[PDB]
Amino acid sequence: NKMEAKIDELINNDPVWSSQNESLISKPYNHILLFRLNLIVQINRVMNLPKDQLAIVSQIVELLHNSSLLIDDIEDNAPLRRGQTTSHLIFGVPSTINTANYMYFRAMQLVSQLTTKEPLYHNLITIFNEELINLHRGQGLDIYWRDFLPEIIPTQEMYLNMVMNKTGGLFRLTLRLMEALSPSHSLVPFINLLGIIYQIRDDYLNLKDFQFAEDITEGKLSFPIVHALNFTKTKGQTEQHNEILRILLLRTSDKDIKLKLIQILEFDTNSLAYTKNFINQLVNMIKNDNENKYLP
Ligand X SMILES: CCCCCCCCCCCC(O)(P(=O)(O)O)P(=O)(O)O
For residues 208 and 201, is the Cβ–Cβ distance under 8 A?
no
Residue 50 or 92 having the CB closest to a copy of itself: 92
For residues 100 and 71, is the Cβ–Cβ distance under 8 A?
yes
d(C-alpha 282, C-alpha 194), whole Å:
9
CA angle 59, 92, 131 (to 5 degrees): 35
Residue 7 or 80 having the CB closest to Mg ion: 80
| Residue 67 contact partner, candidates Mg ion, ligand X, a copy of itself, none, CB within 5 to 8 A by sort of partner | ligand X
Q: Least distance in Å: CB of 98 to Mg ion?
A: 10
d(C-alpha 146, C-alpha 162), whole Å:
13
Q: Least distance in Å: CB of 92 to a copy of itself?
A: 5
User: Which member of 165, 230, 232, 240 binds a copy of itself (CB under 8 A)?
Assistant: 165
Residue 166 counted as an annotated binding residue: yes
- Residue 214 within binding range of Mg ion, rule CB under 5 A: no
- Residue 202 within binding range of Mg ion, rule CB under 5 A: yes
Choose the stretch contacting a copy of itself; rule: CB under 8 A; options: 188-196, 198-206, 208-216, 253-261.
188-196
Polymer length of the chain: 296
Outline where 76-155 has alpha helix (H).
87-91, 93-112, 118-148
The contacts of residue 154 (CB under 8 Å, 6+ apart) are: 145, 162, 221, 226
- Residue 76 within binding range of a copy of itself, rule CB under 8 A: yes
User: Which member of 50, 84, 85, 122 binds a copy of itself (CB under 8 A)?
Assistant: 122
Rounded to 10 degrees, the C-alpha dihedral 235/240/241/242 comes to: 150
d(C-alpha 50, C-alpha 57), whole Å:
11
Residue 72 or 266 having the CB closest to Mg ion: 72
Residue 22 or 202 having the CB closest to Mg ion: 202
Residue 206 counted as an annotated binding residue: yes
Residue 53 or 167 having the CB closest to Mg ion: 167
Q: Least distance in Å: CB of 156 to ligand X?
A: 17
Element (H, E) at 81: strand 80-81
User: Which residues in 140-159 contact a copy of itself (CB under 8 A)?
Assistant: 140-141, 143-144, 147, 157
The contacts of residue 15 (CB under 8 Å, 6+ apart) are: none
Number of residues that bind a copy of itself (CB under 8 A): 71
The neighbouring-strand residues paired with 81 are 84
For residues 194 and 287, is the Cβ–Cβ distance under 8 A?
no
- Residue 72 within binding range of Mg ion, rule CB under 5 A: yes
Residue 54 or 64 having the CB closest to ligand X: 64
The contacts of residue 29 (CB under 8 Å, 6+ apart) are: 66, 67, 70, 87, 99, 100, 103
Outline where 149-266 has alpha helix (H).
156-166, 168-181, 188-210, 214-218, 223-234, 238-250, 255-263
| Residue 15 contact partner, candidates ligand X, a copy of itself, Mg ion, none, CB within 5 to 8 A by sort of partner | a copy of itself
d(C-alpha 216, C-alpha 225), whole Å:
9
| Residue 257 contact partner, candidates Mg ion, ligand X, a copy of itself, none, CB within 5 to 8 A by sort of partner | none
Binding residues: 36, 65, 72, 76, 81-82, 166-167, 199, 206, 220
Binding residues for Mg(2+): 72, 76
Binding residues for dimethylallyl diphosphate: 81, 166-167, 199, 206, 220
Residues that bind Mg ion (CB under 5 A): 72, 76, 202
Binding residues for isopentenyl diphosphate: 36, 65, 82
